Amino acid sequence: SMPELSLTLFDEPSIQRTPKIQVYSRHPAENGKSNFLNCYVSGFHPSDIEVDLLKNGERIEKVEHSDLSFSKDWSFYLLYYTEFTPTEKDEYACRVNHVTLSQPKIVKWDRGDLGSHSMRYFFTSVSRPGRGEPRFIAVGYVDDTQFVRFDSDAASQRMEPRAPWIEQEGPEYWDGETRKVKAHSQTHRVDLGTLRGYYNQSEAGSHTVQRMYGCDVGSDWRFLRGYHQYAYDGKDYIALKEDLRSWTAADMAAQTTKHKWEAAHVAEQLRAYLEGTCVEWLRRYLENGKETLQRTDAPKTHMTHHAVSDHEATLRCWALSFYPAEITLTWQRDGEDQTQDTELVETRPAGDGTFQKWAAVVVPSGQEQRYTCHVQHEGLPKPLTLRW
Template identity: 25%
Template sequence: MQPPCCCFIPPLFYLLLPSGTWADLKGTFTIRLLQTSTFQNTSFVDTEGLGLLEDIELGSLDKHTWTIHFYQPWVRPALPRSDWDTIENMIKIYLQQFNHLINEGAMQKDVPYPFVAQCMAGCELYPNRTSRSFAYVGYNGQDFLSFDMDKATWVLSQDTNLSRYVQAVLQNYTAFSELVEVFFNDTCVDDMEVLLHYGKASLDRQELPVATVFAHTSSPAQILLICRVTGFYPRPISVAWLRDGQEVPPGPELNTSAILPNADLTYQLRSTLAVAPHDGHSYACRVRHHSLGTRSLLIPWGNSEVVLIAGLGAGLLTAMTMATITALWVWRLRKHQQMEESESRNSIVSKEA
């Protein structure tokens, strides 16, 4: 049995390699290549492939034709059409062999259908030009195997009969393990630099966060202060609560959600702080993001604002009540005047008659 997953890595990786030089970008960058193959039975396999630079989707595979779909306009021009044709042919040959070998191994080890095989591989490039490469294999959504680049060995993520069997198969293919090691340790950084050059505009994109603070009364003894932050890009962000100007440390009263995507390719999250009503402290939500530079967003919340809103509501209600009373009094006065004028006219008519 040949390697089940990671021989997919070199073909997909070439999909992401534009020619050129590295632009002046700062920070840590990651390329990830993802493969998901769902084995419904011995004759039907549904395979998806995706290439990512950070959170930017570069390209994917059509699950029916196994052809490449480009998501960014700067990926396709990186290589001649003939090279893309060669890459697509390599992917198709690989997937045919992959499906056959996985089904063969599943039957040998009595693996029940359906099941899912997943692979993730790539590399990280750090600001000091050092790098880290990685390759992982998953089975039914759980970690299964990983590749130790330094020792060129496959490491068990879970100790089962199936994982030991796959590990032994992969370890016997020393030529393949050497290929993975050399490919990612020696060429990944150079390829990353080229890709960063072509994707500089997309990577430089910045969207300012928009933050709002509001309160929700969860019980008579507790108020939830909610800080909602949305519309920001890139993904990394720092959101903290300040109590009397001091950052609230992690604890059971503090809860921050995961960073979630918006439909417009920006992100959102919310942070919640539980406080006692009228505890006498001032609170503010602080947001730090790359698009803000050295500045921070500071959105305060306080009882004074609630009192102001409540006072405004009471004042408005009083004004409306006074206006209603005044209007009623004016209406009654005019009605009384009209009645007096009518009686006066009737009296005059009566005398003339």
């Protein structure tokens, strides 16, 4: 499934973004009903981060988290979560520390087939000055569904399943993905060392490389787009262009890499993978995971009303439990678009494979009924309108 070979950057001789934080339950919170408390952190760089869920101020010990992944702009996101049963008295919060934060930040818990398909592999390596190899985390996605992962800190040293429908694949599959992913981790190990040497950075600092591969297919599952991009310290380094036959080098180090990869016909070999292999395995996964991968889950929508004063109210339009993640929430007033005085949250994972989002508008108390929330999602044959 993964590409077979990765070539290092060269021949033989740091962005700081602060985390956004959302603290929320997976399901509407009812006292006495088991639930999951989520702390979603996103848009941060570098990837090192400290996240604790708190109950009445005390660290919760049985807290798990998602495999490190990143967005198009190379910023990282992680879901931390624990199972809990809300009560009336208990208070929960998320405590985050990161190199961009002078003090820890505490956010209180306030309480048909898809129209197109993609496969993505994301790789992150973080050097560890002073001893040993980089931390290496790889994840694979079909659409918005993670299905494999490799974590160098995990005990198995194996590519591991993260979706039920990938477990069908036989031992040969897991041996091959394990072999390829470990080879990719060594490419990054070399790359981190040579990049440090190109930029004359000290051995005492931790740096990051990020790599992504993927293919897109349209509603017919035929090849639409292929991608391959590489970043150093959260910044573009080199990217394969749309035509899959040339490169975009961001600086002179990447320009040397472009020359090494051009002479070695990297793009020719990647084109065959992105155009063929990648799509073929995507289609195989879509067929084996059909029950979920080919199912759209329309958003479950409702509205809440919050009065902060006698003259001011907040209307919140909620979209819950939807899949895939792409969704549009808009407000209208008297049937015309309204963007003034609105707030939209980043779409976030519920933790059960579905996604959540809300949109809010501040309105004059008594005028709620002028406003309508409009929900567009490919699981809906027609957009939804909600009104208080």
